[PDB]
Design a protein around this motif. Structure first.
Motif, PDB file in Angstrom:
ATOM      1  N   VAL A  93     -21.390  45.728  14.149  1.00 47.32           N
ATOM      2  CA  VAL A  93     -20.167  46.063  14.522  1.00 47.32           C
ATOM      3  C   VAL A  93     -19.786  46.839  12.959  1.00 47.32           C
ATOM      4  CG1 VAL A  93     -17.608  45.910  15.061  1.00 47.32           C
ATOM      5  CG2 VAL A  93     -19.604  44.550  16.323  1.00 47.32           C
ATOM      6  N   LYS A  94     -19.795  47.931  13.066  1.00 52.20           N
ATOM      7  CA  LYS A  94     -19.733  48.802  11.869  1.00 52.20           C
ATOM      8  C   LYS A  94     -18.157  48.989  11.339  1.00 52.20           C
ATOM      9  CE  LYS A  94     -21.112  52.633   8.812  1.00 52.20           C
ATOM     10  NZ  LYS A  94     -21.321  52.096   7.823  1.00 52.20           N
ATOM     11  N   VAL A  95     -17.673  48.244  10.854  1.00 54.53           N
ATOM     12  CA  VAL A  95     -16.206  48.088  10.243  1.00 54.53           C
ATOM     13  C   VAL A  95     -16.045  48.711   8.883  1.00 54.53           C
ATOM     14  CG1 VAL A  95     -15.237  46.452  12.051  1.00 54.53           C
ATOM     15  CG2 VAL A  95     -15.860  45.901   9.561  1.00 54.53           C
ATOM     16  N   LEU A  96     -17.071  48.723   8.217  1.00 49.22           N
ATOM     17  CA  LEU A  96     -17.037  49.306   6.706  1.00 49.22           C
ATOM     18  C   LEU A  96     -17.979  50.531   6.651  1.00 49.22           C
ATOM     19  CD1 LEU A  96     -17.767  45.793   5.059  1.00 49.22           C
ATOM     20  CD2 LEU A  96     -15.704  46.575   5.446  1.00 49.22           C
ATOM     21  N   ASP A  97     -17.362  51.200   5.716  1.00 49.68           N
ATOM     22  CA  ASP A  97     -18.196  52.623   5.696  1.00 49.68           C
ATOM     23  C   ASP A  97     -19.272  52.365   4.774  1.00 49.68           C
ATOM     24  OD1 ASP A  97     -17.044  52.677   2.859  1.00 49.68           O
ATOM     25  OD2 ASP A  97     -15.515  53.937   3.296  1.00 49.68           O
ATOM     26  N   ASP A  98     -19.985  53.542   4.564  1.00 47.24           N
ATOM     27  CA  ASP A  98     -21.371  53.306   3.719  1.00 47.24           C
ATOM     28  C   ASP A  98     -20.928  53.136   1.995  1.00 47.24           C
ATOM     29  OD1 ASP A  98     -22.747  53.558   5.851  1.00 47.24           O
ATOM     30  OD2 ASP A  98     -23.113  55.785   5.672  1.00 47.24           O
ATOM     31  N   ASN A  99     -19.831  53.208   1.743  1.00 50.11           N
ATOM     32  CA  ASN A  99     -19.412  52.590   0.250  1.00 50.11           C
ATOM     33  C   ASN A  99     -19.065  51.116   0.412  1.00 50.11           C
ATOM     34  OD1 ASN A  99     -19.527  55.088  -1.007  1.00 50.11           O
ATOM     35  ND2 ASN A  99     -17.607  55.801  -0.457  1.00 50.11           N
ATOM     36  N   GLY A 100     -19.066  50.559   1.719  1.00 48.82           N
ATOM     37  CA  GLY A 100     -18.642  49.307   1.681  1.00 48.82           C
ATOM     38  C   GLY A 100     -17.277  49.062   1.748  1.00 48.82           C
ATOM     39  N   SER A 101     -16.391  49.973   2.184  1.00 46.13           N
ATOM     40  CA  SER A 101     -14.930  49.678   2.201  1.00 46.13           C
ATOM     41  C   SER A 101     -14.374  49.959   3.839  1.00 46.13           C
ATOM     42  CB  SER A 101     -14.113  50.761   1.293  1.00 46.13           C
ATOM     43  OG  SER A 101     -14.851  50.774   0.229  1.00 46.13           O
ATOM     44  N   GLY A 102     -13.456  49.266   4.111  1.00 46.14           N
ATOM     45  CA  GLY A 102     -12.770  49.380   5.205  1.00 46.14           C
ATOM     46  C   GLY A 102     -11.413  49.271   5.399  1.00 46.14           C
ATOM     47  N   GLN A 103     -10.525  49.777   6.052  1.00 43.90           N
ATOM     48  CA  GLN A 103      -9.065  49.437   6.317  1.00 43.90           C
ATOM     49  C   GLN A 103      -9.089  48.143   7.148  1.00 43.90           C
ATOM     50  OE1 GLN A 103      -6.369  51.639   5.054  1.00 43.90           O
ATOM     51  NE2 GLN A 103      -8.218  51.431   3.661  1.00 43.90           N
ATOM     52  N   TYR A 104      -8.002  47.187   6.770  1.00 37.05           N
ATOM     53  CA  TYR A 104      -7.740  46.218   7.459  1.00 37.05           C
ATOM     54  C   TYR A 104      -7.423  46.377   8.885  1.00 37.05           C
ATOM     55  CZ  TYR A 104      -7.219  42.557   3.876  1.00 37.05           C
ATOM     56  OH  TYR A 104      -7.713  41.660   2.990  1.00 37.05           O
ATOM     57  N   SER A 105      -6.763  47.660   9.341  1.00 34.59           N
ATOM     58  CA  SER A 105      -6.618  47.904  10.845  1.00 34.59           C
ATOM     59  C   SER A 105      -7.876  48.178  11.364  1.00 34.59           C
ATOM     60  CB  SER A 105      -5.794  49.256  10.753  1.00 34.59           C
ATOM     61  OG  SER A 105      -6.202  50.168  10.114  1.00 34.59           O
ATOM     62  N   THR A 106      -8.976  48.670  10.932  1.00 34.18           N
ATOM     63  CA  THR A 106     -10.065  48.819  11.729  1.00 34.18           C
ATOM     64  C   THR A 106     -10.998  47.445  11.733  1.00 34.18           C
ATOM     65  OG1 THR A 106     -10.506  51.004  10.398  1.00 34.18           O
ATOM     66  CG2 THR A 106     -12.383  50.035  11.186  1.00 34.18           C
ATOM     67  N   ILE A 107     -10.755  46.622  10.473  1.00 34.46           N
ATOM     68  CA  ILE A 107     -11.436  45.421  10.669  1.00 34.46           C
ATOM     69  C   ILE A 107     -10.866  44.437  11.726  1.00 34.46           C
ATOM     70  CG2 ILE A 107     -11.726  43.240   9.191  1.00 34.46           C
ATOM     71  CD1 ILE A 107     -11.780  45.208   6.857  1.00 34.46           C
ATOM     72  N   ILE A 108      -9.498  44.539  11.705  1.00 30.19           N
ATOM     73  CA  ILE A 108      -9.031  43.847  12.913  1.00 30.19           C
ATOM     74  C   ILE A 108      -9.435  44.330  14.168  1.00 30.19           C
ATOM     75  CG2 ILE A 108      -6.510  43.377  13.798  1.00 30.19           C
ATOM     76  CD1 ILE A 108      -5.359  43.518  11.260  1.00 30.19           C
ATOM     77  N   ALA A 109      -9.479  45.459  14.464  1.00 28.36           N
ATOM     78  CA  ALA A 109      -9.881  46.037  15.886  1.00 28.36           C
ATOM     79  C   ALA A 109     -11.742  45.675  16.048  1.00 28.36           C
ATOM     80  CB  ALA A 109      -9.893  47.778  15.700  1.00 28.36           C
ATOM     81  N   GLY A 110     -12.250  45.564  14.869  1.00 26.54           N
ATOM     82  CA  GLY A 110     -13.529  45.178  14.991  1.00 26.54           C
ATOM     83  C   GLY A 110     -13.649  43.686  15.517  1.00 26.54           C
ATOM     84  N   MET A 111     -12.847  42.704  14.832  1.00 21.17           N
ATOM     85  CA  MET A 111     -12.752  41.359  15.537  1.00 21.17           C
ATOM     86  C   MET A 111     -12.340  41.191  16.848  1.00 21.17           C
ATOM     87  SD  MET A 111     -11.655  38.975  12.471  1.00 21.17           S
ATOM     88  CE  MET A 111     -10.316  40.328  11.148  1.00 21.17           C
ATOM     89  N   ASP A 112     -11.455  41.872  17.249  1.00 22.93           N
ATOM     90  CA  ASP A 112     -10.826  42.158  18.716  1.00 22.93           C
ATOM     91  C   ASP A 112     -11.786  42.482  19.637  1.00 22.93           C
ATOM     92  OD1 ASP A 112      -8.339  40.417  18.636  1.00 22.93           O
ATOM     93  OD2 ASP A 112      -7.522  42.286  17.814  1.00 22.93           O
ATOM     94  N   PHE A 113     -12.591  43.566  19.058  1.00 17.60           N
ATOM     95  CA  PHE A 113     -13.775  44.227  19.767  1.00 17.60           C
ATOM     96  C   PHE A 113     -14.770  43.029  20.158  1.00 17.60           C
ATOM     97  CE2 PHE A 113     -18.006  45.558  19.846  1.00 17.60           C
ATOM     98  CZ  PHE A 113     -18.036  46.500  20.879  1.00 17.60           C
ATOM     99  N   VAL A 114     -15.158  42.196  19.211  1.00 22.05           N
ATOM    100  CA  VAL A 114     -16.099  41.293  19.498  1.00 22.05           C
ATOM    101  C   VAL A 114     -15.574  40.190  20.421  1.00 22.05           C
ATOM    102  CG1 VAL A 114     -17.625  39.236  18.309  1.00 22.05           C
ATOM    103  CG2 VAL A 114     -17.131  41.604  17.168  1.00 22.05           C
ATOM    104  N   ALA A 115     -14.465  39.783  20.278  1.00 28.71           N
ATOM    105  CA  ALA A 115     -13.974  38.918  21.333  1.00 28.71           C
ATOM    106  C   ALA A 115     -14.158  39.227  22.943  1.00 28.71           C
ATOM    107  CB  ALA A 115     -12.305  38.625  21.023  1.00 28.71           C
ATOM    108  N   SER A 116     -13.846  40.650  22.735  1.00 32.15           N
ATOM    109  CA  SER A 116     -13.874  41.135  24.274  1.00 32.15           C
ATOM    110  C   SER A 116     -15.709  41.305  24.825  1.00 32.15           C
ATOM    111  CB  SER A 116     -13.232  42.429  24.420  1.00 32.15           C
ATOM    112  OG  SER A 116     -13.211  43.041  25.885  1.00 32.15           O
ATOM    113  N   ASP A 117     -16.143  42.066  23.754  1.00 34.59           N
ATOM    114  CA  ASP A 117     -17.672  42.490  23.783  1.00 34.59           C
ATOM    115  C   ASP A 117     -18.662  41.577  24.219  1.00 34.59           C
ATOM    116  OD1 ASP A 117     -19.397  45.024  23.615  1.00 34.59           O
ATOM    117  OD2 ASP A 117     -20.295  43.518  22.295  1.00 34.59           O
TER     118      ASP A 117
END
Length: 279
Positions: A93-117
């Motif tokens: 689940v790619k929540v971090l860009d290729d510089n290794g950074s990510g916004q908290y909103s994206t990270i949160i979406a990724g966690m809720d994605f896994v809970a459903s996925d």
């Protein structure tokens, strides 16, 4: 089973002593479990993953790992040579860009994605998520980690690399997930590892050899490297039927090597992840 000349961290998690180089583990090897690696992605084509890795979600123009960090962490979870759980299924689940950074909103979406996925995947032995990421304290980030755990996923998160109390970092500070500090091959707290009462466990985190992009390998250090040791260990123990997603952090703490790490600050657990495998 025995893997000779294994990376020191694999040998460490199956040993009551530092200084050995063979990893011992039950041949079930996490078969039937799934581990989500929520990170910069995974180079699923790496021969070390044997077809067992796939990208399932990205928030950017590509799902490919253009950094290496996520591929390294996934390798520690479940690559054939560098992984704890050598037969688990890996989902990126790619929540971090290729510089290794990510916004908290994206990270949160990724966690809720896994809970459903996880409901779209076949994981009869259980589901784990490995989160080698974090930033400053955020109640919303912690809540997202707590929801993912509540949904039936064993959540392992990095304590952080600030040599500071992890209470000030997220998702490290969420009480209901498994917060992982880092140790070195001489059983010393890693120089950069965060500490504090919020930590649940230590895993190998200094000079960890694993997979890298371009079909390569390299050795790097961080609580990002300790976390997937614990995530892979959870998947392995769940496949054995010894614990569940809701109880695996506690079980790992119960069964850890105790009192063996140096430079553990007063008030931080002195517990080192251990698979208790008897060959």
């Amino acid at each position: 089973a025995a893997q000779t000349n294994a990376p020191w961290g694999l040998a460490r998690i199956s040993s009551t002593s530092p200084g050995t180089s063979t990893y011992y583990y039950d041949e079930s090897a996490g078969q039937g479990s799934c581990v989500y690696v929520i990170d910069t992605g995974i180079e699923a084509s790496h021969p070390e993953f044997e077809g067992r890795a796939q990208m399932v979600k990205t928030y950017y123009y590509s799902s490919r790992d253009g950094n290496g960090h996520g591929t390294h962490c996934a390798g520690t979870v479940g690559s054939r040579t560098y992984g704890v759980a050598k037969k688990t299924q890996l989902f990126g689940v790619k929540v971090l860009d290729d510089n290794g950074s990510g916004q908290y909103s994206t990270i949160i979406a990724g966690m809720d994605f896994v809970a459903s996925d996880k409901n779209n995947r076949n994981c009869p032995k259980g589901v784990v998520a490995s989160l080698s990421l974090g930033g400053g304290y955020s109640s919303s980030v912690n809540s997202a980690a707590a929801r993912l755990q509540s949904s039936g996923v064993m959540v392992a998160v990095a304590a952080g690399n600030n040599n500071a109390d992890a209470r000030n970092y997220s998702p490290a500070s969420e009480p209901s997930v498994c917060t992982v500090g880092a140790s070195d091959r001489y059983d010393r707290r890693s120089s950069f590892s965060n500490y504090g009462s919020v930590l649940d466990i230590f895993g190998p985190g200094t000079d960890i050899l694993s997979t890298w992009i371009g079909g390569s390998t390299r050795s790097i250090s961080g609580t990002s490297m300790a976390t997937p040791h614990v995530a892979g260990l959870a998947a392995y123990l769940m496949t054995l039927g010894k614990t569940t997603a809701a109880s695996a952090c506690r079980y790992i703490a119960d069964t850890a090597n105790k009192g063996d790490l140096s430079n553990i600050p007063f008030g931080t657990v002195n517990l080192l992840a251990y698979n208790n495998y008897q060959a």
